[PDB]
Amino acid sequence: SHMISLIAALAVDRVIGMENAMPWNLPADLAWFKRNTLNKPVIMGRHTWESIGRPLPGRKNIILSSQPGTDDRVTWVKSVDEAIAACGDVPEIMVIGGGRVYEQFLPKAQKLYLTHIDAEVEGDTHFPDYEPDDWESVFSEFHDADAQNSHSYCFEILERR
Numbered sequence: 250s251h252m253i254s255l256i257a258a259l260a261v262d263r264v265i266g267m268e269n270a271m272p273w274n275l276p277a278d279l280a281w282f283k284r285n286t287l288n289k290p291v292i293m294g295r296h297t298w299e300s301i302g303r304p305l306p307g308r309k310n311i312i313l314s315s316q317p318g319t320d321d322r323v324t325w326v327k328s329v330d331e332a333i334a335a336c337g338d339v340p341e342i343m344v345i346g347g348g349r350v351y352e353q354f355l356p357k358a359q360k361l362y363l364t365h366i367d368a369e370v371e372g373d374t375h376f377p378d379y380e381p382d383d384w385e386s387v388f389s390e391f392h393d394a395d396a397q398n399s400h401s402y403c404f405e406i407l408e409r410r
């Protein structure tokens with residue numbers, strides 16, 4: 250319980266956020282994001298918060314920030330532990346981004362939800378490295394590009410050994 254999970258969209262190990270046009274260009278990824286975070290508390294960094302400016306609905310929105318909070322619809326915190334504790338007694342906590350945020354929660358995470366997008370992005374942010382020998386891949390699902398998804402993509406779920 251209180252299990253920590255990371256959910257990210259990757260183009261060749263580089264982290265994709267709402268700041269880029271591609272998230273919106275892959276509705277299927279968004280549906281996968283909504284499906285796996287519904288009614289779960291989400292933790293995001295300040296920059297991820299700033300790229301949406303409205304809470305994700307039907308979820309406790311926790312913002313890990315090094316600066317004082319600026320929006321009273323979301324819970325602002327200063328540390329990883331403060332973030333974990335703000336989620337309460339729930340089965341699964343979803344860390345949704347910030348490459349730096351991913352890096353800080355990775356050691357506490359037991360589950361990863363990854364979308365591998367067959368696209369190239371020039372962004373300098375990289376998903377943190379995980380030790381293949383400590384992680385097991387338990388689910389993967391390939392999809393071609395189609396009318397609404399401009400790139401092919403493969404969902405993957407890993408769990409810590």
Ligand SMILES: CC1(C)N=C(N)N=C(N)N1c1ccc(Cl)cc1
Pocket residue numbers: 256257258265266267272278279281282293297298301344345346363364
């Ligand atoms: C939509 C997107 C890119 N898709 C996946 N699979 N992982 C995330 N963490 N995402 C995400 C969702 C919300 C926000 Cl605010 C940032 C990223």
